[PDB]
Design an enzyme around this catalytic site. Sequence first.
Site: not given
Ligand SMILES: CN(C)c1ccc(-c2cc3nccnc3c(NC[C@H]3CCCNC3)n2)cn1
Length: 265
Positions: A17-18, A22, A39, A125
């Site tokens: 994002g901006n 993550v 993050k 959100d």
């Molecule tokens: C495609 N794949 C296999 C995966 C797997 C895990 C995550 C993941 C696991 C998190 N766990 C704990 C906390 N944050 C988390 C996270 N954050 C991103 C955000 C972005 C924006 C939308 N929501 C989610 N992503 C993202 N992709």
Amino acid sequence: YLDRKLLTLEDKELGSGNFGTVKKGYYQMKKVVKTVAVKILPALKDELLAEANVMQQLDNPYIVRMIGICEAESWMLVMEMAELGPLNKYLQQNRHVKDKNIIELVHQVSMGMKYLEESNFVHRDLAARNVLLVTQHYAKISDFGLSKALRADENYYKAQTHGKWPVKWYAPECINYYKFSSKSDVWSFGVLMWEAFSYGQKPYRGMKGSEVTAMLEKGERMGCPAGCPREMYDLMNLCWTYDVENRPGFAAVELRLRNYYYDVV
Ligand SMILES: CN(C)c1ccc(-c2cc3nccnc3c(NC[C@H]3CCCNC3)n2)cn1
């Protein structure tokens, strides 16, 4: 505050994002490593610390747990990783998840939201992209960057500045009066359910948020997804009650989902 020397970051990003990104990582806690999502980043520092301040106050099996903050090369918010990731992407890639399984997951989200409502926090959100899967049968709500702790004497948060908002998940009172309540999150929950039973398809495909607003003012709503249980489509329409006072709170919605889920099997 966490020790940056005990945090290792992988290169691949889980999101962006901006604010920044993550990324997956590993955080050495006492005797073992914990798999984490981090993050990574003047105003943004405050926002991240505010976000952490919100997560710190929450403790529920269906909300992502924060490990802590880490000030290093940049500001970092370390969270327990939900390794299957966003619900929308998971269903896009796994079209043969059973309707019962989806009911279980969205019911879990409603339990987390019922808790958020009791705690008097508004998420702001809520969306399938912010429901993370720990396993195919365990969902947690994430992404508290826009969340607000409601004042003890009010049941809504009034935004001053309309930033870049997820208009397609927002209730009319949010768009028109900048008023955000738990019932506003209930509207978002309906959109989330629609996404879930549509295997992660985007809501209001191809429409501008302004055209979504006009559609909703006409009394029009998204249709029933293919194979979606009738009762679940009916629940979505209840969540999309225009009038905030007649729209149910999460207590009612969770109960309805609980009863329906328990009635399946
Ligand atoms: C495609 N794949 C296999 C995966 C797997 C895990 C995550 C993941 C696991 C998190 N766990 C704990 C906390 N944050 C988390 C996270 N954050 C991103 C955000 C972005 C924006 C939308 N929501 C989610 N992503 C993202 N992709």
